[PDB]
Amino acid sequence: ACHDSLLDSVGQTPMVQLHQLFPKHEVFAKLEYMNPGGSMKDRPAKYIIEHGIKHGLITENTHLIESTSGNLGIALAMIAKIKGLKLTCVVDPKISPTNLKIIKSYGANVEMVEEPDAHGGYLMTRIAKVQELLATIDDAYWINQYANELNWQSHYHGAGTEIVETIKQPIDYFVAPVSTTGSIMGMSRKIKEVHPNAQIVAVDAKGSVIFGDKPINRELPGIGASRVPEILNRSEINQVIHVDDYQSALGCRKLIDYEGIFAGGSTGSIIAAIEQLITSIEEGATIVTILPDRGDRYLDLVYSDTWLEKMKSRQGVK
């Protein structure tokens, strides 16, 4: 059937078995990067904005606000443009030129903070700037990605629903990367309605504070956070695997070599994590995962040989 807008092509993404990469397990990858905006963030962007419009929280006059320099900023910018809404993304000087240019191309405003925190980052500065904008822009809506229940709900109704409709056989392990935890919370909640014994495996960056790891400098965007998200309910997570920038990059390079799938940093994290998991679990297990974004924005990260060598040098004592 024809679509009336690009919004109708959000979701119903392909599911692909990774036969070459995992010859002794049944590993299914949900290709969330094949959403029209280029990442899994199309799901919460569409869902959150449409819910707010339906319930009168967002009208054509409401200005959307979020602190994001990445995939969510791009997805919000696309949905906002389609809906006729103003959007301001709060960013910092570390935003990639590419992401900046894509967000501006969709007509979104960018508010770049300049003052680092005394310890050199921009996290507290960006949190403060969000509140400043909420204070000064009348009629605004804060996407509030780390705390908004509509984030996990979008994933419960989004890939989580499509996963249980496709993978009707028992799901032994569900493996997902984390930043807000909206994906793993929403998808695991849907999965376990049908597959109550599915083990839920969170994959996080080494140095991310989500599960209390000791903070280290992290290069990869997408995976990891510098706060504990309000969305997270730790009791729903059964196993936590941490992966470093080098490990994640090797996983990306291995996936493209073995399966011809060119995916982003957090997908490599997933691959590294699944390789670790299969040293402990039963042969032949059914494992489901999600591949959030494309390799295209990681050409100077993961896919750069010079960057990879620098990351290899970081592995501390190793």
Next chain:
Amino acid sequence: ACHDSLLDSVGQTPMVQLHQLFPKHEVFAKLEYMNPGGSMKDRPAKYIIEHGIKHGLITENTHLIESTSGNLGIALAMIAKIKGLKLTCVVDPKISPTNLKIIKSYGANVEMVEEPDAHGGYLMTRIAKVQELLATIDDAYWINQYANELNWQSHYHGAGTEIVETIKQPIDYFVAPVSTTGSIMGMSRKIKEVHPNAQIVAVDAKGSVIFGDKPINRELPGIGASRVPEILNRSEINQVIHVDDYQSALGCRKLIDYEGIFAGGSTGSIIAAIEQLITSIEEGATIVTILPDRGDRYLDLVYSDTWLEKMKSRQGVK
């Protein structure tokens, strides 16, 4: 259903009506950029290679060759990686860093020519280098994009077939950009089996020699050629519209503003051309077109305000 590889997700791309951009006509856009490799070139890459394997022209030992710095190189690199085939793309020093890096990321070899032709380009040098490689690499297969009948056939069986299956109402105009002409030839051939009165409108770059235009320096990749492709049968084309780099870029910017679709240069060409066409045709006409690739690789072209102003300055007497 689950897929066994990424290849199964080639094709069946969305069709979207452009209600905002074309409020007085029924304009349907085939989103070929939503192919897994990021462009319409997934179709000929998959089709040509699979046909050669089926018919014993290509085995696991056959080395694929093509002169391409763009979308076809990326699509071939993906299909070759999946099939376990070696690929060498012949390129020149003008290749974008991004395309170079994507092709290398998929494990393809790159043969960059260095010697310009006496008149400063690399066209004759790249044609010669292809023949050199065919002479020196035993067991090779030249994709031969400008002359290979399998190129147009991929589009006849690809988007052309999906277009007639979806748009069962009379198609008044089919509008497509050209470089090899494989798309417009194959798609128009399928369309006119069902809709014999459909008018076939080619959209080309100003300065492209395909339809004998006077050569000028052209910035946009994707649309236009510096040869008359062997694939082209001119009698099958009913109308030819030429668009310049500025016009094409305005079309891209207008499409993203009106419909939230972030597409590449040749899609903007299509938009400019359809705007010209609707000054002559009947109100309410059904127009079908194709959007070959994403805006992401045009951030320093179309989507750069500084580049756009430079292009505005080129419009000669205008």
